[model samples]
Target chain A: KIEEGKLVIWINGDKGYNGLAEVGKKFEKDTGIKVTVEHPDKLEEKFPQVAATGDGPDIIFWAHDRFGGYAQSGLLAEITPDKAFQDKLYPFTWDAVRYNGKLIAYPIAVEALSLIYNKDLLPNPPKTWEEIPALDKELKAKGKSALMFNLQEPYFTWPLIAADGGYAFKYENGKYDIKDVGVDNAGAKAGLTFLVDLIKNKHMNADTDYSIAEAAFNKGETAMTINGPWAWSNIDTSKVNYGVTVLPTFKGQPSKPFVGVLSAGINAASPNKELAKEFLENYLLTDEGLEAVNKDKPLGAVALKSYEEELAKDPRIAATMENAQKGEIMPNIPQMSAFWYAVRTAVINAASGRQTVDEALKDAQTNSSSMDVFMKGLSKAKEG
Target chain B: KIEEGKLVIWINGDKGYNGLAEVGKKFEKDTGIKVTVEHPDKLEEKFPQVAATGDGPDIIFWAHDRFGGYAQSGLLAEITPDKAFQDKLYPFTWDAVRYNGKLIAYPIAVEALSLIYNKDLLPNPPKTWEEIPALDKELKAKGKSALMFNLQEPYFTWPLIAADGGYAFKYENGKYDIKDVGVDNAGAKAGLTFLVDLIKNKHMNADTDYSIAEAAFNKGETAMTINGPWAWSNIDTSKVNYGVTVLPTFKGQPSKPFVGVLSAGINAASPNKELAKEFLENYLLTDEGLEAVNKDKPLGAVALKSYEEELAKDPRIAATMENAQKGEIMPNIPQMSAFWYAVRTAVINAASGRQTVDEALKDAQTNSSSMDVFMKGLSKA
Candidate 1:
C-alpha cells in the first residue's frame, strides 16, 4: 500500500536511537524501503500533534508504559505479527504491549537494574545485602565508599524492597489489583530498615544522587553502585574497570528491579500500514537487525529468544537479563504515574531517618491512594 | 571564508519559537544565508552536546539566565553590536544579556508577570493585597473564588515579596552579592504575613499549584490570577473573556515581577561567526524583524524601545510592558538557583501554617545560605 517507498520513524536521541539509525540503513538497503528518522523532543505531546495533522511517522518507539495510553486513545493500530514471531519475545515483554486483548507494539529491548561494579576495587560482587557492612570498612580504609545508589529515586530503591518481599502491585488472577497496596507490610519495613542502616552507618551517604553515584563510581570513589545501562555512557572506561552482575540477594530473595521495555508501534492513521507491518516483522525483528539496533550499548535484554545466546555473551546484557528474569515487570497502568512519587518520597524519608519505617510506608500507601483518587476526581471533573 | 551556504538555529517549540521561525525567514531572504530552524527539546542540555561535536548550530536561543554559564565557559562569542542597535532595546533587557561587562547575547523578548482576569466575572480588579479579602467573601457568595496563584511556585510569589521591598539578591552594585539574602527581613516578613492571612482567611489554599491555578482560571472558576505571558496559550479563548493588567498593589507599592528576557547568542566556535553576528543585529533586532518575532502571541514586551508603540496596540503587550517598566531584572547568577527553593518552601510553609512566619523566613535564610555553601562545597569536593 506504501507507494512512496519510505518509512518514517520517531525516536529518542540517546545512544540506543543513534545505534538504531545504523540498523535503519540496513532495513532500507535490504528492502528498498527508505527510512526517515527524527528525534522530536516531548515525543509524547508531539505524537498527538502529528496524528492530528495526519502526516505522522509510521512507527513511534518509546517505553512500554506509554503504550496503553496511546492504544486506549485509538492512536495505535493493532500489531498482529505472526504467533511464532510474538512467541520469540519475553511473554511479559509482549504482555507489556497489550491493551484490551490486542497487541499494540513490537518489543525491542528490556531494561532493569544491575550491580554495576568497579572490577579492580571489587574483585567479586557481594552475594547478599548482609555482606555490605563488612565491605564498607574495607573500602573506607582504602579512601573509598563501599556501595551507593540514588536513595531518593524509587527506581533504585525498588530492587531492595522487592528482594525483601515487598511490591507495589501484586499480579494475581491475571490482573493487577489496585487496592492491594503492600508498602506498609513487614517486608517493606524491613527493606526500609536496611536502607536506613546503610545511611546511618555511613556505608553510603544521603548526598549521593544519580550524578554523584555515577561520578563517584567513575572516579573510583565508590566501589559499587546499583544502577543500569543508562549510566554506562557517563562512565570514564579508561579510569575505572567496571563489571556488571545481578544485584545481590536481600534477606533470601534475589533483588528484583522493575523491568521496563522499549517498544515500537504504528500510527493507526498511517497510509503505509501494510509496508510498515512488513518492515517491522520481516526486517526489524531479525537477529541481524536487532544486533544492529543494539550495536552501540547492548545493555538491554534482547526481546527475541533467538538473539539471547549471542547477546548474553556481553556482560551488560547478561547482567540486565539475569535481573529482568528475576524482576517484576513495571505496571503500565495509568495509575502508576502516582505510584512513583508516593514511593519515592517514602524512600527518601526512610533513608534519611526523617520518619520511622512504619510512618514512611503508611504515608506512602495513603498518599498513593489519595493520588489515585485525586487523579480520577480531576478526570471526572472534566467530564462533568 | 566558510563554504557553507545555510545557517542552522535550534529553538524550543513554544509559541515564542514559532514567531522566531518567521523572523528567521526574513533574515534568510535579506542576507541570502539560508536558515535551518529546528525545535529541539531539552535545549539547555542538548546545547552542550552539540557544542562538544563542534559542528552544531551557529546560534542557540533561550532565556538569558543560561547565557552566563555558556559565556563563562567560553561557549558564546562576545557580542559587540553597535551602541545604536543596543540603545534601541530595553536597558534592563540589554543588561540581562551582559556577563562581566561583555555582551554575550542579543536580547529580544522581555517577560514579566501581570494579573490575568476574567472580564465577565470581574469588571474591576483589586487594587492591592488588602482588597482581596473583601472580594473573596463576595466571590464565595456566588460560589466562585476571587483569585488563585501557584502557592508552590516561587516565580508567582516573588511579586508580593518585592512589593513589600524584599528581594533575593540586592543589586545596588554591578554584581549580585550572595550574602545579602532579603527573604527574612522586615519587608519580606510583612509579605509573608499577608500571604499567611490569605490562607488563614480562606482566600486561597495550599493545594494550589500551577496546573490547578491555570485550570481554575481557564475554567472560569477563579476571577483573577498572577502569572506570566507564558500562560496565555493555555487559556480557552472561546469560553473565557480575559483581560490583562499590571499585578495588583500590596501595601500601596506596585508588585514588581522578575523581568526575564529571552536572548540570542552566537556559538563561540561557529565557523559562520561573522554571518551569525550580522543576522542577529542587522536583521533579527530590526523593527520589522522584531514584529515578525512578536507576531503570533504578543504577550512578551519586546526589548526594542522603538517597537513599543506598535506592540502596545495589543493589550497583552501593554500590561507586560507596564510590569516590566516597574520591575527589577531577575538575577541571572547561578546562586539564584538556591534562592528559589528556599523562598518557595518558606512561602509554602508560612501559608500552610507548617511554621510560623518568623520561623519560616528564618529557616529560608539559613537554608539559602546553607544551599549556597553546600553547592560551593560540592564544587570543592
Candidate 2:
C-alpha cells in the first residue's frame, strides 16, 4: 500500500511518461512527498480496474477517450484546475477532459495530421486539393508525384472527405448527431472521385499502403505525403529537406483532420488527490514541467496556449498547431469503434474503383448508421 | 480471364466452402456453366476490390455481415427467393439476407450457443441462470462446477444479459432502430449481477478464460458449459456423455444468443446471372445438396427446414437449431465491429469486480455511446 507520506503515479510506457518521472522528483523535492512513477502494461485498459480496487495511482497518463468511462464509473477524481490555468490551454484540450460536463483531467499535448513535403521537390505546398492534380504530370516526369499517402486508410481519407462537406456525422450545436451521416452525399462523392481519378491516372496506386507511403516520402519517391507528428522522429533529415504545413484545401475549404489530445486524470480513489492535483496543475503543466518532457524531442503540440507562442517558433509545433486548429478532436466515444473497417473499405473501394464513389461512401454511411443503431440496442443489455 | 460460358466460384477454404464444390458439380452436370470453385486468399477483404475491377467470382461464400456493404455497393445480386422456397429455411436465416429489405443471399446454415452438459454428471440442466449458483458447492465437491464459461468474453456473457431483456438494438417492425442500445438496463444488470456472484462466490474466476473453460469441459473438469456446435468436434464425447440444449433462462426469460448464418451471394457483375441464381436456389438449397455437405460433420443448422429433420436426429444440430430459433441473428452491419472490445472489457470488469456491476454496465453504455459518437464524428470528417 502507498503510505500517506508517499505518492505513486501510473504512467504510460511511452517516451514521454519517463520524462514526467524526472519532473515528479521536483515536486517531491518541494513538498517532501516521496514520488514514485511506474509504467504498467496495457495501462489504458487496466487503469479503470486498478482504480476500482482503491489501490490506483494518484495520477495516470493516457489518451482522453477512456476519460468518460473512468469518470462515469467513479474511478476518476474530479480535478479543479484553475480557470486562469485553464485559459492558458488550447480550448480543445478542455473538451477532452469534460466528461458529463465536469473537468476531470489536466490536458497536456495534442496531435493531428499535416502535410510534410520535401523542400527540394516543390518549395510551396499545394494551396488546394485541386492544385495537386495539375502538378502530378510535372512531378511524374521526374519520377515524383505531388502527393501520396496510405490511400486505403480512412484516417487520411477523412480529411479529403471533410474538405468537400462530407463528415462521419453532422456536428450540430457542438454535439454529434448520429443520424447525420454524410459519407454518401454529393460532396463526399466529388471529393472521393477526385482521389480515385488521381489513382487511375497512375499518380498513386491502390498498393500505396501505410508503410509504402511513409517509405516513399522518406526515400523522396514522392514530393509530399500525409501523416501525423508521431512519424516526425523517424524521418531521415539528412537525405530529405522537409517542411510541414496544414493539409491543402478542397474547393477552397480547409481539409479538417482528426485531432487527438493526450491528457492526465487524477484517480478518485487516491488518498493523495490534493497532492496529485497540485503536482499536475502547478509542477507538471508548468513551463518547467513541459520543458523537461520535451527535452529529448518535442512531445507534441503543447496544450498551454501561452507556452505555444515560444514553441511556435519551431516549424514542427507551428505546423501541428495550425492543422489541429482546422481539425476536429478525434471522437473519443465508443461508437467510434464501428468506424475503422467501414471507412477503410470505403476508401479502398472508391480509390480502386472497386465501388463507385457513391457506392463506397454510402457503404460507410450505412455501416455507421447501423453501428449507431446497434450500439444503442446493446446499451440497455447491462444496466437498468 | 475466365472464358465465355465459364463460371468461377470463390468460396472459403474451410470444409463448408469445399463441400459446395460437389454441389457446384451437380449444377454443372445439369446446366453445364463450366463451373470451377476457387479458394482465393483473403476473399472477404479482397472480394469488393475484385468486384470493382469487374473480375469477381460468380458466387462468394461468407457470414451475413458483409452482405449489407456488398449489396449497397452493387456487388451483390438481389435474389428472388420465392415464398415457397423461403418457407423451407428457418426464420432468422431469412432475416440475415434482408439488406435494406432485399434478399441478397441464399441462406446455407445457422450457428448459435447452447448449454452443453455432461449427462453422466447431471441428468437435468438448470432451468434458469439463478439456479446454477445454488449447486456450486455440490459441483466443487466433485472437483467441478455446475457451469463454466468464458467470463471475460462478451460473446459468452451476452446470453445472461439477453435472457434478462438486454438487446444490442431494437428490432421493430422489420428493421433495427439505430438509437436503441439496451446494455445498461435493469434486466442486463440483474443478469450481470448473477455472473458477478459466480465469480465472488468462487464458482468461477477471472482465470476462466476461453481456453480454460473449453479445456475444463473437454477434460470433464466442469459438468456444463455455454458453447456452440463448433466445439462439439473437439470434445471427446466418449469420455463425457454430452447432452445439448438451449441456454438456461434468466428469471423465467429464455436466453437470447446471437445467431450467425453462413450464406452465399451472387456477384451482380456475373456473366450468367440466371444460371448462378438457378444453381443456388434449385440445386444448392436441395436436401441432396446439403446431405452431401453434412456427411463429414454437421456444418450447422441448415437453413432448409426439411433438411433439418434428418439433422435434428443428432443432438448437436438439434440444440443449435433450437438456440438459433430463440436467438437474434448476430447483426451483419459494420457497427458490430465496435461492439466486441468494449463489451468484453466491461464483462471482465464486472465479473472480476474490478468495478461494480452498475459501474461495469455504465462503462459499457458509455463506451458504446462514445463509439457511436466517435464513429459519427469520424464519419463526418
Candidate 3:
C-alpha cells in the first residue's frame, strides 16, 4: 500500500547519525523509495512529543532498549509480520517485542553482551564470586585496575545477578509478574552475597566509574571486567590482546547477559498507516532487512535463520548469541517504577554500609513480599 | 551530673539488642549505671503513644538519621555532652550529632562500604571497567560465583559517581546545589554503561538478598560480591575462608566507598532531658564509656578515639577500617530523599535495556538536578 517513492525513517547518526545516512541513500536508490531518513540524536525533546501529538516519523531504527519510555507507552503500534517471517527470527529477537504478549515492535537485531579480558594481562577471567576479591589484590599489588563494574550499576552487576540466578521478572499467563523476580533465588542470592563480600573484602573497587575500564584494561591494572559491545567501540584494542567471551556462568547455570534487541515499532497515530505497515513488512521485517541490520550493528541477527551465517563471520557474535539463548528480557510492567525505588534503596544501603547483607536482603524481601504489593489491584475487582 | 550509681539508659532489644544486654549488665557492674534496654524497635509508633501520656526512656539508641525528623516532631530533647567527653570522640563520629552546628548526640560507630574478595580466590581484583566482566566469567566457570552487588542503587552509586566525578550536589554558600548533580558527567555515564555491559556480559549477578549471599558463600558458588561488615554475621565463614580489602584504585585514583554512621541524640520531648544528658556524658562519650560501648557491640568502635590494643588483634577489622578511610559518609541532608527517584529510574532503565547510558543519565541529571533539592524544607521536611 506504500507509495512507490515516498518513505520516511528516523535513526541515530552516531557514525552522521554517521554511516547510516549513506545506507539510507543506498536504500532509496535501490528501492526508488524517497527515503527521508532523519537522525536526531542531539535533540533534547521532540520525537516523543510529536508522536504523542499524533505526528511522528513513519519508521524509527534504534537500539531495542532506547526510547523505552515512549515505546512502552502504547504510543507505538504493533508490527504484526507474517508468522512465516517471524518463524525465521532468532528467539531472542522475536521475544524482544513480545512484552506482555502484545507485539509492540518488529525486532531488528539480537544484541548480546559479553565480558572482555586482557589475555596478555591474565590468562583467564574469574569463574565465580569467590575469586574476584583475591584477584583484586593480585591486580592491585601488580599496579593494575581492579574490577571496573559500577558502584550503582547498569552493566556491571547484571552478570552477577545472572550468575546468582536473579531476574527482573518471569512471564506467566500472558503477562509479566513482578512477583517472579528471581533476585533472591539460590544462585542469585549466592551471587549477591559474593558481591557484598567482595565489597567488604576490597577485591573490586566500589564506587568506581566506567571511563577507567578501558584504561585499566590497557594498563593491565586488573585482569578483566564485565561489559558489552559498545565498550569495544571506544576502547584502545592495541595495548593488550583483548579476549571476548560469554559472561560468567553460575555453578548451576550460566550468568545470562541481558540481550536488548532493536525493535521496529510504528506510531499508533500515523497519517500513512498502510504505507508504514507496508514499509515495516517489506523493508524492516524481511530476512534481508534483518541481515543488513545485524551487519551494521555487529550485535547479532534476530533472524534465527541467519544466525549460522552470522556466527561463521564472527565468533564473538556467536558466543554472545549462544549465551543469549538462555537470556531473559527486561520486563515492562507498570509497577516497575516502584520496584526501582525499593531496589535502589536496598542497593544503596548495601553500598553505604548502612545495612548488612542479611538486613538489606530482608528489607528487599519484605518490600517485595509485602501483602500490599502482592495484591494491589486484585480485590476480586473484587471490592465493588 | 550528680547521680553516683544510677545512669539510666534506653535501648531496643530487637536489633541484636540481646548481644549488648549482658555487656550492659557488665557495664552496670563497672560504672554503676542501670542499663535499661527497651524493646521499642517500632519507636515512631510506640514512642509517640507513650509520650502522649508523658512516659519516655532515659537514654534511647535509635537510627541516627531519624534524629532531625524526631527532633522536629518534638519526640526528643536536646542535651550537650561534656566538652571533655566530646574531645575524646572520633572526629567523624562526634560530627554525626552536630546538627545546625550544635552538638546533638555522641557518636557510636562509623560504617563504610568497600569491595571485599577472597584472598585465595582473587590475587587482585580487576582494575578497569573492561576487566570485571571477564573476571566474573573466569570465576563462575571455576564453580565459584561471579560478582555480587546491588542491582538498583542511588546512594550506593556514589563511589562510581565520584570516581566519575559526578556529584549529588554542588556545595556552595553553605547550601547544596542540586542543580549541579553531575549525573551527566562522563564518569557516571561510562559507569552505568559499563554496568549495562556487565549485565550483558554475564560477569556478575544481582542476587540482592542476604540469605542468598549466605547460601552462595556456603556453597562456593560465587567468588565475588559487594557489601559491608554487617554481612559478617550472615556469612558462613566456617564453610570457607575469606579476606577483606579496599576498592581497587581506578583512573589513577582510588574511588571512595559510601559511609554511614549511627549517632546518639536527645529526644526533643523527653521529660528526663537533663538526666538523659547526664547519662550520656558518663555512659557514651567518656573514654571508659566509649570503650565499654565498643566492646559491647564489637562490630567496631564508633568512638572517634582509637582502642589500639583492641584493633591490633583483629587484622580483618583493620583491613575494613583501611577501606573506610578512603570512603566518604553518605550525605545526610534533609533533601536526600529527592535523589532516590531519578537514580532509581536510571538504574531501572539500564536494567531493562530500555535506555542508553547517556539518555538515562541525561534524564536523571535534568529531573533531579532541580533547585528545590538544595532547600532543607523539601518533601521530607
Candidate 4:
C-alpha cells in the first residue's frame, strides 16, 4: 500500500541545501508530498545511531564509503536502477555503492586525488617521482618546495603507496577479502619510506597538513601538491596559474589513487521508502537535477557519461575525470575502519621519529588484529 | 580633489556579500556610481601588503581589532560621523574604531561571548565558578561534561582571567598603554590555574578545540559552553533546548568578556576615497542598508540603537547585548599581537602539564619582551 508522507533527506554539509531545496519545491508541486532537506550537525555520528533505531531521515545524501557499514547493519534499502539509467552512468561508479553484489546507492559524482601544480613555477609537473629530489634541490635555491601534501593522511598518500603494489584490502570476483589486510606490506613500507625521506631531506615540511599544503600551492610557494577538486574554490580564488594532472609515476609504476563516489541511498526503515526511492530515480538522477545541484556546489566529476562533453570545457574537471579512470574504488567494507586507524597511527609514529618504519608498520598489523576480533563479535551479536 | 571611479570593498569572508551587494545595487541606482564588493582569499594577509603599495580595494570590511595596526600604518582614512549620525549609534561601538582620538571606521555590529547552557541537561546555569565542580560531578555520572570550550584560545579564556583584574593592555583616557601587559599578572595566573585544574580534575578534555567543543555541545554531551552569537546557527539546528546568559561570577567577581565590533574602513590611498566615504555615510550606515545586509547574513548585535526593540525580541541576542554592555572594548593596539601569542602559549603549556601555571605565565612574560623590541624596530623602520 502506498502511503502519503513527507520525504526527508539528510545532507552531510552546508553545501547543496539551497539547490536541493529548490529541486524539492518542484517535486512537491508535481506530487502532493513535501520534501525537506537538512544539513544537520554531527551527521556522521548521529545518522547511524538514529537510523539504527528506525527513526531518522527517509534518505541520506553522503559518500558511498558509508554504504558498506550501513548495509551491514541493515540500515539501507537496496536500490535497483533501470537498465537504461544504469547504462548512462560511468561503470566504475557502480562498484563503490555495491555491497555483496547488491546495488545499495545511486552514484552522483566521482572524486580522486590529482597532482595540482603551479604552471608559473614548474611550467609542467614532474613526470616521475624519481625527478622530485633534483627538482627539490633546484627549487630550494629559489626558496620553494618541489612538492607538498597532507603527509600523514592516508587518503593523500595512498596513490604513492599503491604505485608499488600496496592496497588496503584484497578484492576479487566482486568480493573483498577483509581478512587480507595489506596496509603494512612491503609495498606500503616503500611508500611510507619515500614520504618520510622527503620530510627528512627537507623537501617538505613535517607539519604540512591540508591547509598548509593548499595555501603554499595557492600562494605559488610550492611547485606541486596532491589535492582533489574540493580545493578548487580557494585555488581558483587565489588566481594561481595552475594545472591538474594524474600523479607522477614511481620507478616506472603508475600511481593509482582511491576513487570515492558521492551517492544517495534510501533508508531501510523509512515510512515513505517507496516515495523516497521514486524521488531519487525520477528527480535527483536526471541531468537537470545534477545540473541544478552542481550550479550551487560544483561537482568534481559527474558519474553520468553524458556529462563528458560539458565537463571537458573545464580543463581541471577533465583532468580529474581522467585521473579517476585510472584509480581503484576505495574499499567499502567494515574492515576499512581498522585500515584507516592503522595507517594513521603508522604514519604519525614513523614520521615523528617515535618509531622506526618497520616497527610502526609491524605495530599497525598487530593493532588491526584487535579490530578484526571486535567486528566479528559485532557481526555475531547481530546474527543472534 | 575628487576623482570618479568604481568603489571597491574587500570583505573578510563569504558571509555579508549578498546583503552588502544588494545594498550596493541600490546605491548605484540612486547615485550612478558603480560598487564592487569582493570577498577575496587571504584578505588579512593581502590587504596590508597591497594597501601599503597603494593598489587595493577602496574600502575594507573587517573586525575593529585590526584598526590599530591599519591606522598606525597609515592605511585607513579617518572618518567623522556628524552629530546626527553619531546619535543613532550605540556609543560603545564608537570606541572600537577610534584610534588616537580619530574615527577610522564605521561600526557595523558588536559581539561578545556568553554562557550558553543546555536547558535539558542543566535546568539552571551555575551561579558562580564555585558551583561548577559540583555540577561537573553530577553531569559526569550521566556521561556528559559540565562545561567545554576551546580552552587553549586566549579569546575564550580572557573573560575568566579578566574577572580577577587581568587585562590584555591597560586602557586609560581612551588610550591603551601597550607597555602595561597584564596577561602574566597575579590575577591572570589565578585564572590559568582554574582552567588547568579543570583539565586535571577530569571535568573537561585537554584536546577540545573549537570544533570538538561545538560538536559536543550540539550533541547534548555538554551542559554548557562559552560561545559567541556566530555559533547559534549550528546550536539552533541541533535543536537542543538552550539559553544564553551573562557569564557567571568567578570568586564573587563578574566575568568581563572582550567586546569586538565588525566595522568598515575606507582606504586612505584610494582614488575613489570621497565616493567610498560618501557611500558608507549616506548608504551603508543608513537603517535600510543595515537591514538589507542583516537580512542576508544576520549580525550578532546591531550597532544602531534603533534596532533595540526588534533585537530584544530574540532572547539570545538580548542576553548577548546585555553581556556586551558589561564587557571591556578589546584593546585595539599592535601590542595585542604579543598579548595573544603569550596567552595562547601559556594556556597550551599549562594545560598539557608541560609547565606549571606559574612557569608558563612567567615564560610568557619573557617571550613577550621580544615582541616589544621587534615592534620598536618596526615602528622606527
Interface RMSD per candidate (angstroms): 25.0, 16.1, 24.8, 30.3
Which structure among the candidates has the greatest lDDT? 4
When sorted by DockQ, best at the front, the candidate numbers are: 2, 3, 1, 4
Residue A119 lDDT in candidate 4? 89
Model 1 docking grade: incorrect
Weakest ten-residue segment in model 1 chain B by summed lDDT: B169-178
Candidate 4 chain B, which ten residues in sequence have the lowest lDDT sum? B170-179
Candidate 4, pairs of clashing residues: none
Off by over 4 Å in 4: A1-8, A12-22, A28-45, A140-143, A369-384, B1-381
Candidate 4 structure quality by residue, lDDT tens digits, B282-329: 788777888787666557777776665466467777567646544566
* Complex DockQ per candidate: 0.01, 0.01, 0.01, 0.00
* Candidate 3 per-residue lDDT over residues A1-384, each given as its tens digit: 223336667765431233344445556666665657676753214555566555667766655544344443435665666787777676656656664235666666566667778786677877654556667777777777446655564335656666656766677644454445655566656766667777777665556656566566656666776665545544444456676777666665677766666555666565555666665666655555544544444435344565565457666666666667766755544344345455556665676678865676567655653333322212101110
C-alpha RMSD over true interface residues, model 2:
16.1
Residue B202's lDDT within candidate 2 is 85
Q: lDDT per residue, candidate 1, A321-348, as tens digits? A: 7899998888765446557768988988
lDDT of 1 at B198: 88
For each candidate, report what fraction of the true interface contacts it reproduces: 0.00, 0.00, 0.00, 0.00
DockQ of candidate 3 against the true complex:
0.01
lDDT of 2 at B170: 57
* lDDT (Cα, 0-100) at B284 in candidate 4: 81
lDDT of 4 by residue, A79-126 (tens): 877898899888878867886447888888887889999888999788
Candidates ranked, most accurate by lDDT first: 4, 1, 2, 3
Off by over 4 Å in 3: A1-19, A30-72, A99-101, A171-175, A184-189, A218-221, A235-239, A250-253, A272-297, A336-345, A352-384, B1-381
lDDT of 1 by residue, B1-381 (tens): 223667788776654566667777887777777887787866766886667556567888877777776776678888887877777766656667888888888887777889999999999787677889999899999999999988887778878887766777754314566778788888788887987888888899977998788889999999999877767876745368998887887876668677777788888778888888888787777787776665555537666766666753566766775575455667766566566778878888888888999999998888766464667878964
TM-score, cand. 2 vs. native: 0.45
